[PDB]
Design a binder for these strands. Structure first.
Ligand code: MG
Ligand code: MG
Ligand code: MG
Ligand code: MG
Ligand code: MG
Ligand code: MG
Ligand code: MG
Ligand code: MG
Ligand code: MG
Ligand code: MG
Ligand code: MG
Ligand code: MG
Ligand code: MG
Ligand code: MG
Ligand code: MG
Ligand code: MG
Ligand code: MG
Ligand code: MG
Ligand code: MG
Ligand code: MG
Ligand code: MG
Ligand code: MG
Ligand code: MG
Ligand code: MG
Ligand code: MG
Ligand code: MG
Ligand code: MG
Ligand code: MG
Ligand code: MG
Ligand code: MG
Ligand code: MG
Ligand code: MG
Ligand code: MG
Ligand code: MG
Ligand code: MG
Ligand code: MG
Ligand code: MG
Ligand code: MG
Ligand code: MG
Ligand code: MG
Ligand code: MG
Ligand code: MG
Ligand code: MG
Ligand code: MG
Ligand code: MG
Ligand code: MG
Ligand code: MG
Ligand code: MG
Ligand code: MG
Ligand code: MG
Ligand code: MG
Ligand code: MG
Ligand code: MG
Ligand code: MG
Ligand code: MG
Ligand code: MG
Ligand code: MG
Ligand code: MG
Ligand code: MG
Ligand code: MG
Ligand code: MG
Ligand code: MG
Ligand code: MG
Ligand code: MG
Ligand code: MG
Ligand code: MG
Ligand code: MG
Ligand code: MG
Ligand code: MG
Ligand code: MG
Ligand code: MG
Ligand code: MG
Ligand code: MG
Ligand code: MG
Lengths: 210, 147
RNA sequence: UGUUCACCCACUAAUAGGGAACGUGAGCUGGGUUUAGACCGUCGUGAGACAGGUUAGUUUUACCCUACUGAUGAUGUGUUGU
RNA sequence: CACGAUCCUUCUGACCUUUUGGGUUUUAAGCAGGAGGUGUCAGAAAAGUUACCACAGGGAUAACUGGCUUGUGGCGGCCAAG
RNA sequence: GAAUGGAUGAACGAGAUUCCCACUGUCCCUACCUACUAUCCAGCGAAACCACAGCCAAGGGAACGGGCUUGGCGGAAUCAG
RNA sequence: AAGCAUCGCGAAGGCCCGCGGCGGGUGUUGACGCGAUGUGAUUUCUGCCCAGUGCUCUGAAUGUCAAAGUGAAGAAAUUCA
RNA sequence: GGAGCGUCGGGCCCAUACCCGGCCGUCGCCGGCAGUCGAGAGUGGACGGGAGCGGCGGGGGCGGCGCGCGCGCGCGCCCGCCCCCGGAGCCCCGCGGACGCUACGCCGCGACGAGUAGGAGGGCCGCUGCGGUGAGCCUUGAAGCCUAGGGCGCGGGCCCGGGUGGAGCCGCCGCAGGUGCAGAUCUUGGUGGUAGUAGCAAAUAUUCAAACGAGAACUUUGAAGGCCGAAGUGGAGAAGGGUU
RNA sequence: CGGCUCGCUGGCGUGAGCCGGGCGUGGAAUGGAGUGCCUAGUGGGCCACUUUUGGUAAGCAGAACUGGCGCUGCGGGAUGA
RNA sequence: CGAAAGACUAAUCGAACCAUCUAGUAGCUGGUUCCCUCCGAAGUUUCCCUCAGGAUAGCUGGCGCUCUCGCACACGCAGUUU
RNA sequence: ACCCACCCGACCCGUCUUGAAACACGGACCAAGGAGUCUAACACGUGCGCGAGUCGGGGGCUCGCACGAAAGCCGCCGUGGCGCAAUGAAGGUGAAGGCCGGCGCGCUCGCCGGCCGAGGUGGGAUCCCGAGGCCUCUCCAGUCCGCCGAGGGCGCACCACCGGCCCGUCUCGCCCGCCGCGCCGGGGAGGUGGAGCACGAGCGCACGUGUUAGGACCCGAAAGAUGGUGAACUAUGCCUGGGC
RNA sequence: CGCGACCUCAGAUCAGACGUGGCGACCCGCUGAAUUUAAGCAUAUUAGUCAGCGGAGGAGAAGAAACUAACCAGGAUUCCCUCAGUAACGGCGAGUGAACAGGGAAGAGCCCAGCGCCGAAUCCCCGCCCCGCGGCGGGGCGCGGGACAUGUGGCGUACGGAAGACCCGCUCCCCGGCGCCGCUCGUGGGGGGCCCAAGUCCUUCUGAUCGAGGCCCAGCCCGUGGACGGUGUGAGGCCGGUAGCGGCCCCCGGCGCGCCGGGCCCGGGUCUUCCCGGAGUCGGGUUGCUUGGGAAUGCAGCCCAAAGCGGGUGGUAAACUCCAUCUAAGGCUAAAUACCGGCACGAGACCGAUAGUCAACAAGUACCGUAAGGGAAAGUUGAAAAGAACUUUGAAGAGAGAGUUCAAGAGGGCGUGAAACCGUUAAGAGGUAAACGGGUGGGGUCCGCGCAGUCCGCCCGGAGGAUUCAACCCGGCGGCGGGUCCGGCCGUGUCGGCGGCCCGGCGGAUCUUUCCCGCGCGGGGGACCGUCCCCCGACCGGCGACCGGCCGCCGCCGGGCGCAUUUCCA
């Protein structure tokens, strides 16, 4: 029974939970295991970034996350095309490619491009044989580094531009933000209705002639 | 700590501090929140008034990220910014005034509480309460929207 | 008559009335109530019901304590007997 | 004293809100006010039977004895009209 | 009270009654006899039950006590019943 | 239980089994048979009641009666017929 | 001639109540003590001039707010001093302060103390294990067990002595819990009374001798008397048993 | 006492609300108060004086009041809630 | 399966046994483990398919806090009275 | 502490019960075992860390882990939770007020400059000021130290009360705004709903108590379901033998 | 009335292949309760859960959008945190209950059908030769058979593809073998093997020591080794081990080089011309299940049944209308994840033989039940069997002696040996069952005494003996305390140096792109501010934060001080 003041509460212990409790005595082991395997992936892919492949800048979705920026799944085809990379080669120089990404905004497009431009620059493409052909980089940048990059390659920092202390013009001052919004909101609400009344008015004027 | 618990002091006494007329029987009310209508009524209706009944409008696939307008009062708008902005200003002599981007620092709506200090500003925000604008303007400042 | 009760015959001095867990089932009997089978009647749509009739239907244990009945003994009187 | 909650329904109310990517219309959902009822009346949706019975409990409760009581039954006075 | 069968009916029945004859220990009204027991002994050898225990009168008391009160009173260890 | 008396069925059937099948029992059967009941040898009878509750027969003459189909309006969901 | 009834006396009896005293605990005290004067407390102390037996010449109040152990005093000699506790000698000491003071300590006054159900506190009560810690204990004897031995604790319990035993165990501070039993017709095991009791009574039956043998009511051999009485207590099989 | 406020009320005035000042023990007896959280058991009761309903009554049933028992020993009432 | 009695179905039958769901549910019976110290009840309220149970107040405890002055210098409160 | 003696006292515990020594139930005896747990979730209390914050998870970086499956560290340190804002079914809105001077007719309404800046009343621990005394070995002067303090103040926290602010809703009103003059937008005064605001108190961990959900203090049904094993007894049918 | 093609279909102990059962912790596919809760009960709940059936693998399943969203948008699945006990469902009761977004682990992508081009360019099988051969493979050669046009193979698949011209740049990838080199992270990959420090030192207990005391520095030695176990108690150093980028020997993997045998003439952009998609599927109705999915989230049966600027989705039914977003009806895919079964390891604040698994042992054993099924009890002599020779009594069991043992008061179910219960011995008692509380008394048992207990300790007085000093100075050492803060180190608050500021760093939503470097942004300077450090002087708290002198006092040692002092002793 309840007894004088305190959350009514519905706790979900009606099915056979005890049969299916999950205990985390693993966890430490699992932190270790994963880490070992991690270290072994690095030692496998000797000079390639442990991180993995270069991944692109991307905004998050939804009015919430909106302003923040993440890593993407991979660079979209427009972005390769423009940076001048063949899509089946990108996979082979450490460049994540998703192809399902639309590209709407020209800004993001050029950002990612600037990544790939940046990347190819600071990449140390080894040759096929030790006998050097074109593309594969110089013996200088090879001896001085067969060196990995620990941590995600070209890390995606979400950045701000500082707006200096202005003056506030009298014209800037004058604005009436609170109203302008309330109007705006209303003008969306009503946009459809009005234009039905206008369509009725134009019909009444044409009907007057006939 | 069993050590410190009551059951250690009950040893010997018979009913184990559950009385002996009425006993520690299994489930005499009924299990859980049974009887909110009948027989446990009184409790639910002097300690959870409003439990029973429907009220308002369904909303089938709510998604919280649409209604995400976190707010900041004017009271502490200048907390968003490094003290030396608020210092260099009440100085400078230009009548420059800084910008405070609220959508930077994590809010979308400048609500109106608090006395705001006699110190011109600009304030970028997705929204404003009427009074929050009137306090900024009264200071000598620009409310600037940003989509 | 299963009866308590009742009634009637006969004798008699008289055929007074009552109690003891409505004395008394490891004392009996079990005829009646009061399981289960079944019959009738009345009731019930029915399963069934009936202080309404009928018939058939396992009555366990004492070797303890006591009580009681009988039976050895016991303490004393030095020991024994009369 | 003459009357009734949640849930559902029904009507009535605003140039009302929502009907979800936007718009118009239907429909629906809201908000608020009356109504349809719960008489076991603070509001489950509900017939029996068991002698074939079953379980948990109850001397918080019947069927004996025994207590109290003595109306009733039984016995006995006082008065004295007959 | 009429195939929810009504009324009958020889024969039959470990069926329910009633009566008569014979018969008898059913009874007056109990006695005797036999065998197996019980009994006693040698050998062997369980069980149920068991708060403590174990003489009564009355009293009061959860209104019928072995224990309490007040009286009566009390004598090892046992046997067959 | 014999006897008596009803009821159903002519087989693409009655009755009944089966989770299911061009399944199975009755049936290696066919009305003097199979199945369903009641009463209960023989003798002798077996009255009246079709209002009730059952069972059954007949059916465009005919109240109600679903899903579908047909028409109706509507922008349609639809509603009406 | 009440050990009766009624009305009345003196005296005497004893409850866990009342009174005084001790002791344990609780509660209360703005309780006391980190080291100081002080018991209706109603001041202490510079420091400067002017002076001295002067003083503050105020209520049958019966008195507290003012008076007779000194204010000035005895010594150095009208003038100077009126001195320092590393020493006044002490009932108060402001120079430094317990034998006392684990301040979760210690001390002092009061009042109080029934308790189921129930709650709360403190247990240097107790059991098992972990971190710490006892330069802990232990084959010159651990644990456990026994004990008409000696003690402590209100108690939970504990410490000692003796015996037995033969390998491990404990105190303190913390942590942890599968932590305390008279009962549950509780579970398992073991043991009494019952009790040397109830019992070893269905189907007629045993006896005499001899042998073997440590030992014979019962084994075997002989004799006698008996029974089953061919629908058998006789001879043979099935099923079942599984070496009988 | 003095002055302000009012959109109430009103022949003027009421009434209420505000400021600003002026005045101390206002029957006996007793006692330190106030206040907020969390909260267990309990929610079968019974007995007595007085009141009182039912009932012929009851160690009966049911109420009021206080106090008991229940939770409680102790002296007395022989024994006893 | 039953020539029917609810008979029989491996000592089981008005629904066999074995195992699992299962530690089923129980307003009901039963038990419920050391010491001291302190405070210390209720059996009444309203609601309840409530009357052997819950809820709710009441009563209990615990924890506190705010203040109060025996530190010659008190305001409030009461199972009274005037 | 072992036995014995006598005087007085003394009924058997457990339990339900208004009432138990009961002619209420459990208990012959002894040993060992045996019942309020653990997880989750809330609540209040309490301890610690930090404080308009807090926070650690989950992950990652540091080692073969002896102790480590620890410990430490991380623009991940904050994705994120919880908190710092409420209210409304929703669309949505969203916590300040005052004063002063000026301009609009001060119109208890509208617009422009300056100052103060979370209102007020009563009570309130505490602080502050303090007339004044109260003495000092003399008559006055007289700074220092106190003791108390009549009286007056600033007044925490909390309470009572009044105004005030935000959201919902109603009533009644009159003004203002513009890229879109509109069934647009914004205000005012007065009531009334709100788990509000009115210079923040939370977060993390730990302990306790309570209340549930879980086997949920321990033990207890009559039943209910799923899936199997049985006709050696027994019930009936059939086949193949026996018997009277 | 033949022979022949094919088609559909048979038979073979025809040739070679493969499936069959098990295990089932985890996974996939069906199937699917009821106890229970709701204080009754029927929907709901329990639960898509137990039981039932099927099929797997080291994982499975999933998966490369007919996706989310509505944003400035993201981009296969899985998994964790969060979302969220939320939206939603529910006799709107009890109860149930997700999803996207955000941060993480991991991360990997693809192939057909179709539409088209290529003399079917393809495949399987037979037979000879060379290689290779314990996962039947490579090359060659056969008018040797079949499959295949009812469609094999290359190209290509929605991220678009094909074919043409001319712009550009240039030509390594795979496998079957055969060798050979570097033994390739727990710091030499895996497996196996065998090896590697140091006391039995000195006394001494003991039955036996691993104990106890000692050992050129807690003692000797080693210690990259002091984990553990064994050994007649307690062991770093007796033995095994342990430690160690320690040793050797095998065997096996994995990667580096060389040679051979084959295969393989394998690009990109730019303009032109073509090509483009899965039907009884979608979708609608419907019924039943199912879901949080609400005028239908999914999955079904039945009926109906499409389209191509279509189709689906866009969490309220319907029509119109814009937007968005995917591309369904074919398929493959490692990885984080799972794991009460198995093989093999490690560990534990767990249990310690009524516990812990039913099971420490000849346990799923004995035994029970026709069967399904049920299902125990049961550990311990001692260091060593040294397990009691021999005598004796007895038919023997049993004893009596003797012996072994440290011990048999350890004697083969034997460590310890509790209680209940019994036998005996000793003491005491006994007609109100026993037992108990309080109070004494009697007796016993041991304990403590005393063969005076007159118990000690100061100070003092006296009579006897006793050595050396106190007191005093002198020398040395140590300590305390102190001011003059005297001299110097030391540090707090303030002021002066703008001195560290660049020879002082970090931080900053303070600025400047006059700078530099890398591509309006990133990094680094350069200013600015905040914060942390050098130099001296002055004032002040002169602070336990210290030195040096000096002073004062204390103590210790050593000198002297000889006895009216000084302690000792009675
Ligand atoms: Mg990563
Ligand atoms: Mg108690
Ligand atoms: Mg109890
Ligand atoms: Mg309790
Ligand atoms: Mg209760
Ligand atoms: Mg009788
Ligand atoms: Mg009798
Ligand atoms: Mg009898
Ligand atoms: Mg009879
Ligand atoms: Mg009968
Ligand atoms: Mg649309
Ligand atoms: Mg009956
Ligand atoms: Mg009957
Ligand atoms: Mg019957
Ligand atoms: Mg009764
Ligand atoms: Mg009676
Ligand atoms: Mg009849
Ligand atoms: Mg009739
Ligand atoms: Mg008795
Ligand atoms: Mg008939
Ligand atoms: Mg009819
Ligand atoms: Mg008490
Ligand atoms: Mg040993
Ligand atoms: Mg444990
Ligand atoms: Mg016991
Ligand atoms: Mg006998
Ligand atoms: Mg014969
Ligand atoms: Mg024979
Ligand atoms: Mg024979
Ligand atoms: Mg009760
Ligand atoms: Mg009670
Ligand atoms: Mg009840
Ligand atoms: Mg108290
Ligand atoms: Mg008390
Ligand atoms: Mg009861
Ligand atoms: Mg009773
Ligand atoms: Mg009685
Ligand atoms: Mg009972
Ligand atoms: Mg009994
Ligand atoms: Mg125990
Ligand atoms: Mg807290
Ligand atoms: Mg609570
Ligand atoms: Mg249980
Ligand atoms: Mg619980
Ligand atoms: Mg059970
Ligand atoms: Mg049921
Ligand atoms: Mg229920
Ligand atoms: Mg229930
Ligand atoms: Mg039920
Ligand atoms: Mg479900
Ligand atoms: Mg299953
Ligand atoms: Mg298989
Ligand atoms: Mg797979
Ligand atoms: Mg696909
Ligand atoms: Mg949350
Ligand atoms: Mg569910
Ligand atoms: Mg093809
Ligand atoms: Mg060695
Ligand atoms: Mg050893
Ligand atoms: Mg060792
Ligand atoms: Mg469902
Ligand atoms: Mg919609
Ligand atoms: Mg797949
Ligand atoms: Mg065992
Ligand atoms: Mg054992
Ligand atoms: Mg065991
Ligand atoms: Mg043992
Ligand atoms: Mg051994
Ligand atoms: Mg043993
Ligand atoms: Mg020994
Ligand atoms: Mg021994
Ligand atoms: Mg032994
Ligand atoms: Mg003895
Ligand atoms: Mg004797």
């Amino acid at each position: 029974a309840p007894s004088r003041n305190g959350m009514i509460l519905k706790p979900h212990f009606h099915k056979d939970w005890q049969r299916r409790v999950a205990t985390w005595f693993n966890q430490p082991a699992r932190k270790i295991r994963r880490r070992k395997a991690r270290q072994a992936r690095a030692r496998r892919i000797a000079p390639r970034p442990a991180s993995g492949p270069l991944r692109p800048i991307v905004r998050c979705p939804t009015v919430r996350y909106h302003t923040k920026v993440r890593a993407g799944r991979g660079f979209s085809l427009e972005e390769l095309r423009v940076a001048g990379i063949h899509k089946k080669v990108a996979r082979t120089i450490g460049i994540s490619v998703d192809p399902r990404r639309r590209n709407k905004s020209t800004e993001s497009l050029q950002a990612n491009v600037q990544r790939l431009k940046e990347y190819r620059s600071k990449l140390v493409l080894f040759p096929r044989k030790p006998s050097a052909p074109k593309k594969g980089d110089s013996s200088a940048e090879e001896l001085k580094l067969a060196t990995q990059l620990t941590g995600p390659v070209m890390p995606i920092r979400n950045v701000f531009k500082k707006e200096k202390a202005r003056v506030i013009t009298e014209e800037e001052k004058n604005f009436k933000a609170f109203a302008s919004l309330r109007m705006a909101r209303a003008n969306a609400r009503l946009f459809g209705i009005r234009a039905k009344r206008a369509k009725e008015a134009a019909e009444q004027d044409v009907e007057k002639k006939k | 700590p069993s050590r410190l618990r009551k059951t250690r002091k009950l040893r010997g006494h018979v009913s184990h501090g559950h009385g002996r007329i009425g006993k520690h029987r299994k489930h005499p009310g009924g299990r859980g929140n049974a009887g909110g209508m009948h027989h446990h009524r009184i409790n639910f209706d002097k300690y959870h008034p409003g439990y029973f009944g429907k009220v308002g409008m369904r909303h089938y696939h709510l998604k919280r990220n649409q209604s995400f307008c976190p707010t900041v009062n004017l009271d502490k708008l200048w907390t968003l910014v490094s003290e030396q902005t608020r210092v260099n200003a009440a100085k400078n002599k230009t009548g420059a005034a800084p910008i405070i981007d609220v959508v930077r620092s994590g809010y979308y709506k400048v609500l109106g509480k608090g006395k705001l200090p006699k110190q011109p500003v600009i304030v970028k925000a997705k929204f404003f309460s009427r009074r929050a604008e009137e306090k900024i303007k009264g200071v000598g400042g620009a409310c600037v929207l940003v989509a």
